[PDB]
Design a protein around this motif. Structure first.
Motif, mmCIF file in Angstrom:
data_model
loop_
_atom_site.group_PDB
_atom_site.id
_atom_site.type_symbol
_atom_site.label_atom_id
_atom_site.label_comp_id
_atom_site.label_asym_id
_atom_site.label_seq_id
_atom_site.Cartn_x
_atom_site.Cartn_y
_atom_site.Cartn_z
ATOM 1 N N UNK A 143 0.827 -1.199 0.000
ATOM 2 C CA UNK A 143 0.000 0.000 0.000
ATOM 3 C C UNK A 143 0.864 1.254 0.000
ATOM 4 N N UNK A 144 1.934 1.261 0.801
ATOM 5 C CA UNK A 144 2.820 2.421 0.835
ATOM 6 C C UNK A 144 3.514 2.635 -0.504
ATOM 7 N N UNK B 250 0.595 3.605 -3.290
ATOM 8 C CA UNK B 250 -0.274 4.754 -3.024
ATOM 9 C C UNK B 250 -1.735 4.435 -3.343
ATOM 10 N N UNK C 62 -5.430 -0.450 0.632
ATOM 11 C CA UNK C 62 -5.562 -1.904 0.667
ATOM 12 C C UNK C 62 -6.069 -2.250 2.065
#
Lengths: 157, 159
Positions: free
Chosen positions: B16-17, B20, B23
């Motif tokens: 997710x990081x 972007x 989730x």
């Protein structure tokens, strides 16, 4: 300690010919705990904001082109941040979960920036559903070039 | 200390990081009752799955045994081995189920249908027949088995 101020206010009322009243509140065993919880949360928010103000000013001074006061003697440079939040833009991220207690931290962190020389026009607040989404919203907030520090309040433990 | 739930969470957070994109990651939480219900359900599903898998293997063994094909060896020692491949491609199947205790026999049928499909079985070749009870199974099974375009028949009773 409490009667002297009332006596002084009565004397001031007689002197100035104006209605000056004075009032106190007596607390039972439970309101004391309520007030202590509120004060503790306000203090936590205040310290959270102060620790970001100091880091912002430390970044300002550390990359600057001028050195400042040395150690207790001399010949040893020291870098530190002043507690002057003048001209600094901040960004606060809070979670809607347990808002009835998170809002206390938010309010106790806004007024610190205000009282340290910061105007409310440089404060941007963002609310997120839970603590899990805090980093990914703080990322987008930090993406802005008009942000100098990020303060994030969650709710766990 | 789980070696699984920690690593999946770390991977999803890093994904997710890095991309972007949100989730949401949610798992289940059961305490001594939903676990038993889930175990009973998966046991029924596995029962139907192996019920269809054995029929697939037997059909392929029948095709290979009476066919004219030089089979492979155990390890290269010239001892040929006849065994049924688990590839239900080209096979046609017929399932007979009794609507008595349908809330479980339907789980059996569903656990057999996907077992046929995932192994290459085309959906056009599966024929399902329902009967009021197990006592009706023999005649319908006879009618289905008499057909030339049927390679296996699976049936489910009641208890």
């Amino acid at each position: 300690n409490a009667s002297v101020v009332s006596k002084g206010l009565a004397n001031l009322s007689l002197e100035l010919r104006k209605p000056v009243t004075f009032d106190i509140i007596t607390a039972d065993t439970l309101e004391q705990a309520i007030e202590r919880a509120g004060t503790k949360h306000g203090n936590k928010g205040w310290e959270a904001a102060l620790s970001a103000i100091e880091m912002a000013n430390l970044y300002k001074s550390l990359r600057g082109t001028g050195h400042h006061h040395h150690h207790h003697g001399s010949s040893i440079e020291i870098y530190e941040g002043k507690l002057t939040a003048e001209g600094l833009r901040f960004g606060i991220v809070a979670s809607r979960f347990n808002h009835t207690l998170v809002d206390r931290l938010v309010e106790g962190a806004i007024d610190c920036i205000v009282r340290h020389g910061g105007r409310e026009e440089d404060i941007t607040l963002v609310r997120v559903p839970g603590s899990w989404e805090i980093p990914v919203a703080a990322d987008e907030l930090a993406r802005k070039e008009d942000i100098d520090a990020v303060i994030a309040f969650g709710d766990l433990i």
